[PDB]
UniProtKB/Swiss-Prot annotation, chains A, E, F, G, H, I, J, K, L, M:
The chain crosses the membrane at residues 10-30, 53-73. GO terms for cellular component: plasma membrane; proton-transporting ATP synthase complex; proton-transporting two-sector ATPase complex, proton-transporting domain. It comes from Pseudomonas paraeruginosa (strain DSM 24068 / PA7) (Pseudomonas aeruginosa (strain PA7)). This is ATP synthase subunit c. The record marks 60 as: Reversibly protonated during proton transport. F(1)F(0) ATP synthase produces ATP from ADP in the presence of a proton or sodium gradient. F-type ATPases consist of two structural domains, F(1) containing the extramembraneous catalytic core and F(0) containing the membrane proton channel, linked together by a central stalk and a peripheral stalk. During catalysis, ATP synthesis in the catalytic domain of F(1) is coupled via a rotary mechanism of the central stalk subunits to proton translocation. Its main location: membrane. The gene is atpE. Belongs to the ATPase C chain family. The keyword Lipid biosynthesis does not apply. GO terms for molecular function: lipid binding; proton-transporting ATP synthase activity, rotational mechanism. The lineage of its organism: Bacteria, Pseudomonadati, Pseudomonadota, Gammaproteobacteria, Pseudomonadales.
Swiss-Prot record, chains B, D:
Belongs to the ATPase B chain family. It comes from the Bacteria. This is ATP synthase subunit b. The lineage of its organism: Bacteria, Pseudomonadati, Pseudomonadota, Gammaproteobacteria, Pseudomonadales. The chain crosses the membrane at residues 12-32. Coiled coil: none annotated. It is found in: Cell inner membrane. The gene is atpF. F(1)F(0) ATP synthase produces ATP from ADP in the presence of a proton or sodium gradient. F-type ATPases consist of two structural domains, F(1) containing the extramembraneous catalytic core and F(0) containing the membrane proton channel, linked together by a central stalk and a peripheral stalk. During catalysis, ATP synthesis in the catalytic domain of F(1) is coupled via a rotary mechanism of the central stalk subunits to proton translocation. Component of the F(0) channel, it forms part of the peripheral stalk, linking F(1) to F(0). F-type ATPases have 2 components, F(1) - the catalytic core - and F(0) - the membrane proton channel. F(1) has five subunits: alpha(3), beta(3), gamma(1), delta(1), epsilon(1). F(0) has three main subunits: a(1), b(2) and c(10-14). The alpha and beta chains form an alternating ring which encloses part of the gamma chain. F(1) is attached to F(0) by a central stalk formed by the gamma and epsilon chains, while a peripheral stalk is formed by the delta and b chains.
Swiss-Prot record, chain C:
One of its GO terms (biological process) is proton motive force-driven plasma membrane ATP synthesis. The chain crosses the membrane at residues 40-60, 101-121, 157-177, 190-210, 229-249, 256-276. Coiled coil: none annotated. The gene is atpB. This is ATP synthase subunit a. It comes from the Bacteria. It is a multi-pass membrane protein. InterPro entries: ATP_syn_F0_a_bact/chloroplast, ATP_synth_F0_asu, ATP_synth_F0_asu_AS, F0_ATP_A_sf. GO terms for molecular function: proton-transporting ATP synthase activity, rotational mechanism. Key component of the proton channel; it plays a direct role in the translocation of protons across the membrane. CDD domains: ATP-synt_Fo_a_6. F-type ATPases have 2 components, CF(1) - the catalytic core - and CF(0) - the membrane proton channel. CF(1) has five subunits: alpha(3), beta(3), gamma(1), delta(1), epsilon(1). CF(0) has three main subunits: a(1), b(2) and c(9-12). The alpha and beta chains form an alternating ring which encloses part of the gamma chain. CF(1) is attached to CF(0) by a central stalk formed by the gamma and epsilon chains, while a peripheral stalk is formed by the delta and b chains. It is found in: Cell inner membrane.
Length: 83, 58, 286, 58, 83, 83, 83, 83, 83, 83, 83, 83, 83
């Protein structure tokens, strides 16, 4: 019992920490090019801002599945029930 | 697990999704196909007018 | 009943095998199904895939058999849009004269789209109606055909048979084996060429075998995750709590709206990879 | 998961549908599009030739 | 049995975490080039958007095979049956 | 008890440690293009500064969730209560 | 049997997780150059598309050998036999 | 306590070590663009230096929380109390 | 015996996973520059292709040794006998 | 205690090694831009060299805190006690 | 006996896996620039190939050492004699 | 003593290994910019070479502290003296 | 006796593996700009080649200490005599 409970605290840290690492670097790559394109054509900013939020939905797609399975492991536990 | 509860929940969600697609995804596709239907009609009609072209024999 | 039991029931296909009980025989439990040999068919998956294949083929034949040449009717207008789109996609990717590539691309795109379309309806509507019609409240039944590895492998292995067939038909048997051993690296002298033939085969054979496996798993992956997330969202309502049910309906709608992109992209990408892979069996790239 | 003879059955279905599609679905539809495209091309070329013919009359 | 269950919680976290990390950095690269391409000429935005979704299905392919298998190790379990 | 508590200290370090790693790299990628845009178009810096804070909220979305959960694990450990 | 089986869930998570990580970044690098080439040369898109899918066959080849041996370790086991 | 304290020395190394790694790489990216802008147009330096310090605050924000928690676990200890 | 057989299962996942990660990123970089050159100079495409394959041979050389040894450790085992 | 003492040798290695990794990569990015600026504007080198040392103070800020704590855990020990 | 033998499979996997990762990424960077140079000046390609092979020797030098020590640890293991 | 001595071998491997990894990547970044500058302005080489050694001193500073501590932990041991 | 001999096999894989990883990436970066400079200035290639060898000596400096210590631990193990 103690090993499954202790190894699920670390499984939650890997699920949220690797998602945090990827989402923070992915928005630095996408947002750096949004500020560079907004300097190139400042009249197209409204259009580029909508196209950036469409891509933001694609970055935070697999990260929200992992942040949702990681909150499921802290308030419920599918492994503990398996003894 | 209330199997009946699951069915009711899925049914409500599906109804909302169908409503969205019917009032959001259906209008653009029917409009696009009907516009093509009109372009073809204009093109065929214009050819018929071109068919009615005559040259004066003077 | 426990939620682990509901999820484990949903992840089982309707299987058939010639058991000693009688000529006709079906699996009544998960263990009894897994115990059978490779000579047992998933009847639900063959049933839905053949049915939707015939539906696609029938609605297109209803238009093709009475094509007006001039002004098109409501159905013919839609059928022409699909043919025009596929022919454009083929002509932009392939420069040859093969008459099989366009009918194949249209068939592959519309069939795979319809096999995935039956996933948008509530996941336990069809299984309960199938159970009630059959008279067995504990029957296994899965509607979505692409969530079974066998359906996606059947599509890719069949495309691979055409890729190998056309490659041998135009390059010749000796030429085809030649592409796998004489390219990309070659030399003016035999002593260096003999040292390059294992390197050539190690690059070409690996990159050739990954084509059927990638097509199947790319189609299976997104679809299997999609059906499984709907089964998990359905368990959320089973708890009976009002706030948890309100979250479940909002997530189900958001996931279904996101899935309208996935259903379209996987069908389109399988079509494009099919056209591209066949187009490179009629040309040379080393 | 379980790999079964289902992939053989699926391969048979794939070829039957593709061969029927190639012989009875695609050729009749592309023939209609080609006939229409020729009529739309001729509708401009014949009309332009008839309009240019006036230069000889002059 | 507790070791197989505890190491399955880590396997699920590594399987979803490395997918969340790869998909967030991979779309930050693809998305950044899409916004940069939009800045050169906004007349081509509709065409480029269609090309982005054609690549999005190639980029997010193997990351969904791991998310599907990970949700299949939490509820179903192929390692417990093996004893 | 010690294996649940000891592995929680590592779970906490992974939650905020991976968050610090991703936000520092992400703000170097994002901020580097903000200084380049300000050097090319100095009259647009008031606009670019507002556009940067819209990307900063997206870049820190999953990282602040990790920080919140890390503090929760340190002062109200949800695993010690599961025996 | 318990250690060989519990360490095979970690082996599978590394085969599919490292392959998912490398292909999502590789297609973000490859696809990011395809979207720029499609903007720089609007008439070259059909040629660039077929040339990109040749590279896509090289990019995922070794990853698919790893997703295939991982599925083999998940439904069969060459190690359990070694006991 | 042996196990709790032992694993807390590792937790502190991960908190300060991952924070140092991200902050050092982040300032390499941010600072590289500050020198590029300062060389491109030298009269912009008074402005670019102030803009660099605004971004430096966002860049180190999570790293400083990580260092704060690392010195808290070094001299005080919440996990030890849990017994 | 079971620790040698279990660690060999991880050794195989580590051999193939790192090789898959490396080649997928390597071809994203190489192939990305091939599409860039093909877009600017469409006349050079038949020549650049041959040159891309020259490099592809060097890029996979060590990776092929790695997957070859990984398969060898699954169907045979030089360690089990060493015990 | 043998384990408390032994885990501080690994803590010190992570704390100095991750700092060395980040600082070595960080100065490669910052210094590479200093040479690029110096070649473009030789007359600005006296100013650019002083600005590089402003950034170098921020880049090493957390790395030096890590080295200070790592030497503290080597010649003294806050974890050896509490046991 | 089993720990030394088992941990040598992990050592062999790390010597070849890390080498494969570096060599695959290294040639993606080197080859990417070689195709850019070949597209720019197609008259110098014979000279650029020999210059690329000079660098290829330096790039794989330590990788060849690591795969030569990994095939030495695999056949006639040097650590078994030490105990 | 066995685990303190055994974990000191890994501590030394991490100090020199992470230092070697960072210093090799750091000089690849700094070195590429020196060759780019030398190709652009061959008259500037005497100055750029001296500025490179000023940066090389900052780049290797923490790596040499890591290698110095690693040689100290090899020929002497501050942990073994604590039992 | 066995854990020191087991862990020193992994310590050698870290020293050579991390060194191989860093130097292969470092020479990909350094060599990529050498070929770009030679493709830009064909007459300067004999001058750029000697400058690349001066930088190669800095890039591999710490990596040669790592492989030197790795071969020392393999044949004349210094930790197996301290237990």
């Amino acid at each position: 019992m103690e090993t499954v409970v202790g190894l699920t605290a670390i499984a939650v840290a890997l699920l949220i920490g690797l998602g945090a690492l990827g989402t923070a670097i992915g928005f630095g790559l996408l947002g750096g090019k949004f500020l560079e394109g907004a300097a190139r054509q400042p009249e197209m900013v409204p259009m580029l801002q909508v196209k950036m939020f469409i891509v933001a939905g694609l970055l935070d797609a697999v990260t929200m599945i992992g942040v949702g399975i990681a909150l499921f492991f802290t308030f419920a536990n599918p492994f503990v029930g398996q003894i | 697990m209330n199997i009946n509860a699951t069915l009711i929940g899925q049914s409500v969600a599906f109804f909302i999704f169908v409503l969205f697609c019917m009032k959001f995804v259906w209008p653009p596709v029917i409009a696009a196909l009907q516009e093509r239907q009109k372009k073809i009609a204009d093109g065929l009609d214009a050819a018929n007018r071109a068919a009615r072209d005559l040259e004066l024999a003077h | 009943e426990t939620a682990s039991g509901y999820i484990q029931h949903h992840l089982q296909n309707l299987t058939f095998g010639r058991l000693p009980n009688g000529d006709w025989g079906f699996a009544h439990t998960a263990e009894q199904a897994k115990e059978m040999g490779f000579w047992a068919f998933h009847v639900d998956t063959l049933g839905w895939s053949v049915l939707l294949g015939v539906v696609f083929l029938f609605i297109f034949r209803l238009a093709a058999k009475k094509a007006t040449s001039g002004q098109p009717g409501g159905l013919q207008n839609f059928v022409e849009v699909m043919v025009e789109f596929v022919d454009t996609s083929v002509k932009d990717t392939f420069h040859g004269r093969n008459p099989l590539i366009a009918p194949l691309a249209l068939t592959v795109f519309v069939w795979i789209f319809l096999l995935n379309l039956i996933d948008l309806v509530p996941v336990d509507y069809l299984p309960m109606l199938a159970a009630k019609i059959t008279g067995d409240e504990h029957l296994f039944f899965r509607a979505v055909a692409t969530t079974d590895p066998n359906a996606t492998l059947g599509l890719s292995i069949s495309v691979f048979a055409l890729i190998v067939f056309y490659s041998i038909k135009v390059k010749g048997i000796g030429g085809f084996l030649g592409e796998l051993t004489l390219h990309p690296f070659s030399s003016k002298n035999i002593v260096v060429q003999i040292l390059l033939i294992p390197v050539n085969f190690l690059l070409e054979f690996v990159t050739l075998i990954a084509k059927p496996v990638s097509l199947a798993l790319r189609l299976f992956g997104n679809m299997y995750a999609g059906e499984l997330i709907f089964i998990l969202i359905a368990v959320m309502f089973g708890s009976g709590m009002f706030l948890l049910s309100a979250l479940g309906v909002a997530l189900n709608w958001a996931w279904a709206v996101f899935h309208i992109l996935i259903i379209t992209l996987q069908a389109f990408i399988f079509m494009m990879l099919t056209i591209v892979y066949l187009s490179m069996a009629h040309e040379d790239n080393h």
